[PDB]
């Protein structure tokens, strides 16, 4: 994932 704590992934 590009990051954490976001619903996109």
């Amino acid at each position: 994932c590009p990051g954490k704590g976001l619903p996109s992934c």
Partner: antibody
Amino acid sequence: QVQLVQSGAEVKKPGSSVKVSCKASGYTFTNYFMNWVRQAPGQGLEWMGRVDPEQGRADYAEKFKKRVTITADKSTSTAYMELSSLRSEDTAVYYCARRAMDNYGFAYWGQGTLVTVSS
Amino acid sequence: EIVLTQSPDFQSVTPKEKVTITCSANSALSYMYWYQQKPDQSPKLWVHGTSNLASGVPSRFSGSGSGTDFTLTINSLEAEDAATYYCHHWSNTQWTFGGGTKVEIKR
């Protein structure tokens, strides 16, 4: 206010290793990845790696997997990046960066830490 | 291995003119990001999601792109707009940056 304060500049001889710190404040440390980026003077940006400070899991770029170790200490909300087997081409400014509140782009950056590698 | 090539490396623009910065890829990719960096400073997030301006970015900046080609456009250039602009993309499981396009004022 989200704040990323890094360690000071450093002079290094070839073959040595440099460890750079990044103190985080203004946000819950473990909820966000801490990315590390570097930029040689006048050259482009290079993503080095990142560490999730909740579990300590890290992801590195293929170029930097061999020599870069990125860690995080939750107690002091400080992140670290260590680069080994230094060479003159490793002379660069090293940033720690965090994503924006509502998207994945890097919105928050540290002041930058200059590491000069030379004899 | 997803390589982002930015053209041109250098560009001089008269104020009030239009400038387009291209960030081309090898594969079709999505969700491009852009940054503005000025000398002796860290980059500032400028565009995210390939078309959404970051907070505080004036509307004369326009992000766009599809498939392999992505563009950042300044429609009425201003003195403050001079900077090096970078593109940024995530291909599993790493980030990668563009070379950078330096924009300077023409007088």
